[PDB]
């Protein structure tokens, strides 16, 4: 028998930080949900998928309104995960 | 909703992205890219999550367009969730796949993800460490060594994520 690491190659990516709202437009859908799509329609060619949670959680970082932090949690990936979108 | 449109990698975009630091892609024609999609927005003793359809429809459209077959399940308890995941997991298309993209869309608190019949007086509850040990390689050995993305579209808990400052 041969080892294999139980828990690896995970991201999980949520909307607000611990303890907090997350919003929700009724008729236009999640605010989080509209800025995750964007930014992968625009940087999944270029950019690996942690570089572009990271820009996410960047587009959140002025308090307007309606305040939220999406939090990166429990990433165990060990490379750089590129969609590589037309391939 | 959103039309999930992405720009693409060029031939030579992606051969300049060369590592042994990058995890590997597999063959366009023959691999069996798999995403789920369990949004809840019909509850038993908390509000209506109106507007979860345009999410749905922008997710989708977009994990479409990655490459990824997309399964769609709506308004599940904690339990329908746990044996949906269960499910997913055990796959055969895993095995002829190279990554998988989990997206939940519902209320939640500081412990998880609200399942349809959670109340106060009555908790339905998904917990976080439950989803990372259902796609776990034990649980998951399909997955091993692949990429495993989880998106949460969810509240936790119910204060404003703010300090007000003079
Ligand atoms: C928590 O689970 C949930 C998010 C979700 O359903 O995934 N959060 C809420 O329902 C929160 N609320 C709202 O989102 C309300 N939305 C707005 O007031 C709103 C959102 C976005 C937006 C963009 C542009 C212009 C205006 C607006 C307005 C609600 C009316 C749906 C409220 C109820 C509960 C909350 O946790 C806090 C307030």
Redesign the pocket.
């Known amino acids: 028998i041969k080892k294999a690491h139980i828990e690896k190659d995970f991201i999980a990516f949520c909307?607000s930080t611990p303890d907090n709202?997350?919003?929700?437009?009724?008729t236009?859908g999640?605010?989080f949900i509209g800025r995750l799509i964007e930014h992968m329609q625009e940087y999944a060619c270029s950019c690996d998928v942690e570089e572009i949670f990271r820009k996410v959680r960047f587009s959140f970082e002025q308090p307007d309104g309606?305040a939220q932090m999406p939090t990166t949690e429990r990433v165990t990936l060990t490379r750089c995960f590129y969609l590589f979108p037309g391939h | 909703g959103s039309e999930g449109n992405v720009k693409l990698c060029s031939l030579e975009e992606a051969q300049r992205i060369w590592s042994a630091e990058i995890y590997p892609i597999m063959d366009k024609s023959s691999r069996t890219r798999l995403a789920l999609i369990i949004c809840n927005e019909e509850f038993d003793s908390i509000?209506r999550?109106?507007?979860?359809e345009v999410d749905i429809t922008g997710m989708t459209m977009l994990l479409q367009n990655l490459g990824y077959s997309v399964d769609v399940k709506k308004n599940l308890t904690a339990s329908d969730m746990t044996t949906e995941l269960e499910a997913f997991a055990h796959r055969p298309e895993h095995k002829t796949s190279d990554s998988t993209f989990l997206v939940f869309?519902?209320?939640?608190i500081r412990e998880g993800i609200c399942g349809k019949k959670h109340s106060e007086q009555v908790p339905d509850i998904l917990q976080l460490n439950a989803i990372f040990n259902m796609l776990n390689t034990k649980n998951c050995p399909s997955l091993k060594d692949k990429p495993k993305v989880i998106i949460i579209?969810?509240?936790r808990g119910?204060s404003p994520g703010v300090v007000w400052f003079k």
């Open positions: 909307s709202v997350s919003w929700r437009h009724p236009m999640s605010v309606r | 509000p999550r109106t507007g979860a869309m519902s209320h939640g579209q969810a509240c119910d």
